[PDB]
Structures are given as structure tokens and as C-alpha cells.
Amino acid sequence: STGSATTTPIDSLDDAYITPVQIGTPAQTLNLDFDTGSSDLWVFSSETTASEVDGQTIYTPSKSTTAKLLSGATWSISYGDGSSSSGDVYTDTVSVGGLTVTGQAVESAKKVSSSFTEDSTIDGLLGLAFSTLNTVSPTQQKTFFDNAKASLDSPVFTADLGYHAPGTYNFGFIDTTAYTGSITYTAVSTKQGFWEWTSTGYAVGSGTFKSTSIDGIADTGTTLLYLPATVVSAYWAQVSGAKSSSSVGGYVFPCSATLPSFTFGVGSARIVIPGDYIDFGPISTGSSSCFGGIQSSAGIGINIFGDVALKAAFVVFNGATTPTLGFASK
Numbered sequence: 401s402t403g404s405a406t407t408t409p410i411d412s413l414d415d416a417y418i419t420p421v422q423i424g425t426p427a428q429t430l431n432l433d434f435d436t437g438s439s440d441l442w443v444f445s446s447e448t449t450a451s452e453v454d455g456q457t458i459y460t461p462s463k464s465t466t467a468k469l470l471s472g473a474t475w476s477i478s479y480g481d482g483s484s485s486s487g488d489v490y491t492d493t494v495s496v497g498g499l500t501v502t503g504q505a506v507e508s509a510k511k512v513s514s515s516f517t518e519d520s521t522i523d524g525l526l527g528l529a530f531s532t533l534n535t536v537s538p539t540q541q542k543t544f545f546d547n548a549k550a551s552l553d554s555p556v557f558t559a560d561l562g563y564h565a566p567g568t569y570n571f572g573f574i575d576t577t578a579y580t581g582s583i584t585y586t587a588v589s590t591k592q593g594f595w596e597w598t599s600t601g602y603a604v605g606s607g608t609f610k611s612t613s614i615d616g617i618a619d620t621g622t623t624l625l626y627l628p629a630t631v632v633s634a635y636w637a638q639v640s641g642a643k644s645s646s647s648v649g650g651y652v653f654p655c656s657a658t659l660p661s662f663t664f665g666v667g668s669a670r671i672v673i674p675g676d677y678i679d680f681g682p683i684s685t686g687s688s689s690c691f692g693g694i695q696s697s698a699g700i701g702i703n704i705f706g707d708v709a710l711k712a713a714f715v716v717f718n719g720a721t722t723p724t725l726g727f728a729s730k
Contacts, residue, residue: 401551402572403499407434407561410521413680414707415623417561418521419569422495423506424464430457430523434569435621436559436595436717437704439533439543440477441494442485442507443524444516452512455520459508466502467492475507475535480622480700483515489536494544496526499571501548505534505541525621528557528717533593545571545719555719559620560730561711563677579714579728584669588723592702594619595717597725599705600665602627604635609663609670616703618710618717618725624680625662625673626697626704635662635694642692648683651692655682662694664709666727673712 407417418431423443430443444456461467467490476486487510494504509516509524516522527534531542549555552572560578561567568578589596594617603609614627632651636642638660642653653659659675678693693708716726 401499401548402553402570403495403497403548404568404570405497406566407569408566409562409564410519412564414561414564414711416519416522417567417620417707418523419496419526421526423459424461424492425466426464427495428457428459428464430459431521432524432526433522433621434526434528434559435619436528437617437619437621438477438479438525438527439529439531439593440475440507440525440527440535441505441544442475442477442487442509444512445487445508447487448509449511452517454517457523459506459524461490461492461506461508464492467506470505470536470539470541473505473536473539473541475537477535480704481515483513485509485512485516487511489541496544496571497569499548499552501544504544504547505536507536528620529595530590530593532590548572549719557717557719559710559715559717561620561707563674563711567711574716579730581729583714583716583726583728584666585716585718585724585726586666588725590723594702595723595725600667602631602665603663603670604638605660607638609665611665614664614703616697616705618715619704619706620710622704622706623708624704624706625694625708626700626706627694628703629696629698632694632696635660636692644696645689648689648691650695652683652689653692655688655690657690664705669727671709671713671727671729673709677708677712
């Protein structure tokens with residue numbers, strides 16, 4: 401089997417991407433944030449505290465003939481941005497892009513934090529990291545990808561995120577029309593439950609490439625590129641008037657600037673992030689200070705190749721017995 405679904409930016413900045421997902425029978429279509437940095441499929445639901453729902457589409461298990469309570473199971477998750485959600489669990493049929501999983505754990509939110517309530521466009525998350533990070537207790541549950549894997553033509557999914565445009569998530573096949581050149585594969589450590597890999601270095605603009613190992617995760621659920629403070633300082637030093645603002649919470653730059661590209665290494669290959677991808681626009685409406693798309697990881701404890709980086713590539717998440725991660729230009 402295979403599946404193919406279009407993923408759409410939620411706003412003009414590409415702050416996140418939503419992908420329609422069919423849950424239940426008859427289908428209830430929710431727009432989920434596919435997140436390769438977490439491992440829970442959770443949704444706004446008929447159980448979510450009413451004051452915490454503001455325009456999201458909800459899953460109502462009582463209207464699904466295939467829903468079953470997963471008795472006694474609860475979940476609770478906290479993300480890197482400080483957001484959180486928790487609730488109970490149903491099993492149900494879940495389809496993405498024509499690919500169907502029966503018996504998928506669908507984590508129904510009873511509570512969500514303010515950042516989720518305030519985002520009307522995101523009806524929940526679909527985690528695509530390793531199932532060892534799933535938060536269901538007392539019986540940990542599998543991701544949609546882990547449940548689909550054995551049925552897929554190839555045990556892979558691919559992320560092809562757009563810059564200010566729709567893109568695609570495919571499951572079970574590699575669309576050889578979707579990228580240029582060849583795919584460079586690189587080793588993955590699953591020790592922390594993430595798609596963790598080591599970049600071979602970076603360049604700023606037309607500058608020389610610096611060979612240096614940068615361990616980090618491929619995380620579709622993170623907007624920005626978070627890298628070591630040395631690398632980030634080297635990038636923003638090339639932008640007149642850029643500075644790190646403790647008041648804003650990261651590097652800002654004049655909105656009049658033209659940003660340089662940023663290149664990262666994948667083995668001997670190179671992925672170039674155009675400068676325009678690094679502009680996240682005014683810090684507040686009408687400001688002439690703009691927020692940078694490359695930020696320090698120093699306060700995180702991990703480097704994160706988020707959407708800024710991933711949308712410059714065609715990315716293969718290879719879930720074979722020995723997982724690997726492939727990158728191609730596009």
C-alpha cells in the first residue's frame with residue numbers, strides 16, 4: 401500500500417503545515433500537524449474542555465462506529481515550545497492520503513494549552529518520531545507510520561514541504577519526480593526516539609564550507625532551524641544590523657535586509673536554504689524588526705532541523721530495520 405497527502409502552510413509565514421486525516425466511520429476529517437519530532441496522534445475532540453476549543457474541528461468518537469475506548473489508557477505530552485495536551489485514548493480507523501490503519505490509537509484531548517486553543521487551523525498532531533516516545537500509559541502505543549509499515553510497499557515516508565506553498569507527505573514510496581539529482585542517505589540514531597542525524601557542516605552565503613559535525617533532529621513540527629550558537633552567530637554576522645534580542649527571544653534583523661543563504665552538509669552533499677526562507681517577518685505587526693529563521697539551540701539541549709531546513713529538501717524518513725534519513729535538493 402501507499403498513501404499521498406497534500407500538506408498546506410497554516411499561514412503566510414509557514415509557521416506549521418496541516419494535512420487532512422480521516423478518522424473514524426463515517427470519516428471525520430481533521431487537519432493535523434505531522435510532527436517527526438513526537439510520537440502521539442492526538443486530536444481536539446468532543447471531550448476537550450469547551451473553553452479550550454476555539455474554531456478547531458473536533459473528533460467525536462461516539463459518532464464513529466469503529467471507535468473503541470482504550471480502557472484505562474491516558475496520555476500527557478509537553479513540547480519543546482512549552483505547549484501541552486492530555487486526555488484519554490480511543491482506537492479507530494485512520495486514513496492519510498488513501499493509506500488506512502485500523503486500530504490506530506487516537507489520543508482524545510481533554511485539556512490543551514493556550515497555544516493550541518489559539519491556533520484554530522490545527523486540529524491535532526500526528527507524530528512520526530519513534531514509538532518509544534509515545535506518551536500513552538500504561539500501554540505505550542504505536543505511531544501511524546509504525547502501524548502502517550508492514551503494509552507499505554517500502555517502509556518509508558517522505559516530507560516535501562513547500563516554501564509559502566503546499567507540499568506533500570508520501571507513505572510507502574519515493575516519488576522520483578519530486579527531487580533533482582540523487583538522494584544522499586545518512587545514519588540515524590534512535591537512542592532519544594528522534595530522527596537524529598549528524599550534519600557534516602555548513603556555509604553562510606557564498607562563504608567557504610566549514611566541515612564540522614552537527615548532531616540534530618529532523619523535526620517537521622518545529623518551524624525554525626536551531627543550531628549551535630557559534631554557527632548561528634556566524635550566520636547573523638553577515639546581516640547588517642542583526643542582533644540577538646533577549647526581549648524578543650532570539651536573533652532579529654532589519655526588515656530592509658537581504659538575507660544570505662545557509663548551506664548544510666549531508667555527507668558529501670549540500671542542501672542550500674535560500675535567504676528568503678530565513679525571513680519570518682516583523683516581530684509585531686508593522687515593526688521594521690524581523691524575526692530570524694535560524695536561532696540558537698543553546699537553551700534547548702538539541703539542534704533541530706525544523707521546517708526552515710527541511711522545506712529546502714526532499715526528505716526521506718527510512719524506517720527499515722536500520723533507519724536512515726535521506727536528503728535531496730528539489
